[model samples]
Target: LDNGLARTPTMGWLHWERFMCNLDCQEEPDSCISEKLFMEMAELMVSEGWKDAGYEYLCIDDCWMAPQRDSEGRLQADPQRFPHGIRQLANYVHSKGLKLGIYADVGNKTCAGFPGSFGYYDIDAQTFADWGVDLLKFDGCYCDSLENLADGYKHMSLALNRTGRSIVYSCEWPLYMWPFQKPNYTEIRQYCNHWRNFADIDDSWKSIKSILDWTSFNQERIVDVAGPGGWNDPDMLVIGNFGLSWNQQVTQMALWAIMAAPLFMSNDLRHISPQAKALLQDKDVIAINQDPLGKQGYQLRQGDNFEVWERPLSGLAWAVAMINRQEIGGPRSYTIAVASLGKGVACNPACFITQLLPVKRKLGFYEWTSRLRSHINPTGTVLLQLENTMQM
Candidate 1:
């Protein structure tokens, strides 16, 4: 009953990072959450080649709702910003071969101080279902007490299921109350497709590194929770933005793909650079992120400000990322011995290795006896995929 949706990690364009709650369209018309902005983005996603590359959902984060509900207590779109209403907007996105995603909060008010679904779970869920929302990002804010968190999310989950719509339910329950009060992983997996496990990410290298450190630190507990139905979201990809450089953007894409995190871009698709677009749409990286194995990668080793991450993929393939965590004057060189992959040595002696990004080419086959050396840029990564074709 709860198995069909989000079988793979979700991929899409989310508005929160790029256009955060800019309700006053008059002042910030171009970067606001309105029907016009969404419509324009929807067009770009189709015409600019993002939609065809597995970016299916165009999600609006928050502040799209009006200050007050309608006479019947149903949620209403801001008349000035979304003059055509959400259903019409959903229809437009669907017309462009993309799904529509909306956001809500579990408290009386959202993080941006908009009305939330605290007491209107059923109504709001039904309302979104009626309007053809394909995904729901449910945030947690203003909830009076920590005890109300789990039940609040569960209530909305049940309400959404009751609507009989297959909406991908994304929860922020863990992000708000972790280390102090841990949510039941098994229970959340039963209800949510994915959940925010860390803080929201900004368009900065520092933010990205911090999140990576936290996730790796707790990999043992969280990695097992992610699979076909549930994922531990680290946040949106801030690629194509001003803060991340070209090498940094590639590193972000490669590592996120290795971790099997959802690939939700928060960039201006129509105005992004060609290099960024290529990285975002790289088929090899996308394949690892969507690998049917559904295993979240873990940190294999860390020393001297360098780290190695590995992910098991479908068809006996594996993704390995060698990351340089600090700034240096020159490239840092490292070697990855085949036996260090931790799956027995001489048993499977040879395999094919290919560099996934930056230099997408065959790095050649290597035996367990030899080592693959990589020259990585500072604060960058060398991502490689290994295909074990030899008989064990």
Candidate 2:
């Protein structure tokens, strides 16, 4: 189960949400799904401070595959779009000190009607390793039946191991199996580096809120399940894309950080605005996300169109996010006490508070009796990093 990679949540650029299955290379060359598209993102990530900020994996999603397998039963890249092939693309990304991730489905056909890994596990796994792929986003598109789904995932996990490579396994098990029964997370955590527990995220405040609600509603299980090597992925972040306003973008980054979700950007990296770049490269939020503790946060409290989330960080530190859930209103004021944030945080002596998002401002020190008030913009957040002085 421990594949010895992705010790923390993954940070990368994935071509799914924004660039989705756009395989029309002739008519939509710039926006089409091709090796050039991923390579541009890889270079942008390296040159535009993304790699510096810790997004090291460049992922290829669906439609990058050929319509059919090779002559000897092997997955191959779409010849016209991916002219140089996936192995060559992997080499290009690797030379930039970045890793490559490719997508595949567990069912008979992919969601986009390409060949899946249904009858080919070991060969596919070995092919990825041989190409120096650093991660595999194994989807569950056309697959069905509990037994078939479970067996497919388990067999792929074993096949990945046999390759003797360190490819991070991102599973869609929860996505396929969550409707009728709760997935055996104990076994899932044992097999997957990170797993999608909900639906794919679209670029909108409502979509982000829905995901947040889902994660918060199931916090009791997710908070305890995520650790060290495995994480509860709520899907990719669409922060730099359209469908969300500036404030909504802030809310997404803040909440995603607090949740310890994988920071995979699905936007067109080459054309994103400077403001979008700044939000994506915010070091403060990234720190909370990549905290060595690997503990996922939860909604500490919810009331009056707002929610409070608390993630326990390493060295007795804590990251708290106060979010405004409204979209049409002005800033909303909420008050919270330091002592109420539980999880080994003691304010009997003193705790230092520093705001991380919106603006970097230190709020000095506080005690158990101190009540802090935050005025969060509509669909925005006030993210705080706290250190228990007494513990230090």
Candidate 3:
């Protein structure tokens, strides 16, 4: 399947070059490829309870490659940055029960002018495989014209497949950012396992709230394309790591997990705060996203001040997010009727039940302010989790 994410949802980290711009070592681009630092990050993820939470991959973004390619156009790693070569790092990551990931552009050059795989597609893909790369963030950059877009992505997709290893993540920031015509949602889904549906997402409560709102608005377009090999990306998770108050961080993690978005952390794992650990490692919330039913949730109902999303989990559990869409308020209570969410429609199940509580809220939101009446529970969420029993 496309990258094997079909089995279970995952949570991990991404090294955004924009944040860590400019390499410390110019000659050895991989200089930042610190096995020690990475291991520490891995330990943090594990310590935070990701060891078995499915957050196995630690990725390096831009600048892992040299400024230019060799005579054969083969992209090369910055020796100064990656002193021991990627393989050593990959092997090290493996020893710690983690997988190695890297990034590249689908166009002539990466966003930062690092060598891209446009012309040397085969070689670069092969080289990545040789280096034990487990995932590739295939960015779309440097195409001279719009007409070149389709061909560019198709070529890269095939090249990656040819490598015979590694999961390819197609990321065309603002997929429609450029002047050229872009692929439809369905078309883009084929080339990308996940995408950057929005520009950079930050950690503030307001920012996260906006991101979730935008995701809800645009989610309908991505429904048909989500499945074992395809997905609708809502960008990365800033929850638990974004520099925000502890309560907000907890809400953020609960929100993202319930929404089933890619759980990529942006904070420094080495110094993860205890609050962040609790937020990131919350298994109850993570379960909603990783439900074995292999179903993605949708904004089932929306209102002027409140909205609801739903996902059917294993045993017919329905993971629901009932968020207050209000921009600002000290705290507000919301409610939904059982019939409104198909409560009794358990599909001939042997047993069906609905439970509800507050999963996460602004610090002052009163308890039991929210409730669910269907096969869904008020898991203390603007988000909720529902279960429908199918067993005998």
Query: After superposing candidate 2, which stretches have Cα over 4 Å from the reference?
Result: 344-346
Instruction: Name the better of 1 and 3 by lDDT.
Output: 1
Residue 154, model 1: lDDT of 90
RMSD of each: 1.6, 1.4, 5.3
Cα deviation at 364, candidate 1, in Å, is 1.0
TM-score of each: 0.97, 0.97, 0.83
State the displacement of the C-alpha of residue 170, model 2, in Å, after optimal TM-score superposition.
0.4
TM-score of candidate 2 relative to the true fold: 0.97
For all candidates, the clash counts are 0, 0, 30
Q: What is the C-alpha lDDT of each candidate?
A: 0.87, 0.87, 0.62
**Residue-wise C-alpha lDDT for candidate 2, range 308-366, written one tens digit per residue:** 98888988788999988776768888887788864546455678889988888998888
lDDT of 1 by residue, 1-392 (tens): 16488888999999998888787777788887889889999999998888888999999998999998999999999998899999999999999999999999999998999898988999999999999999999999888777677788999999999998889999998887774687678988888999989988999998989999999999988998899889989999999989998778888999899888988999988689888888998888998899998988889999988999989887777888988877867788898678787354321567788888667989887776768888989888889888886642
Local distance difference test, candidate 3? 0.62
| lDDT for residue 385 in candidate 2, whole number 0-100 | 90
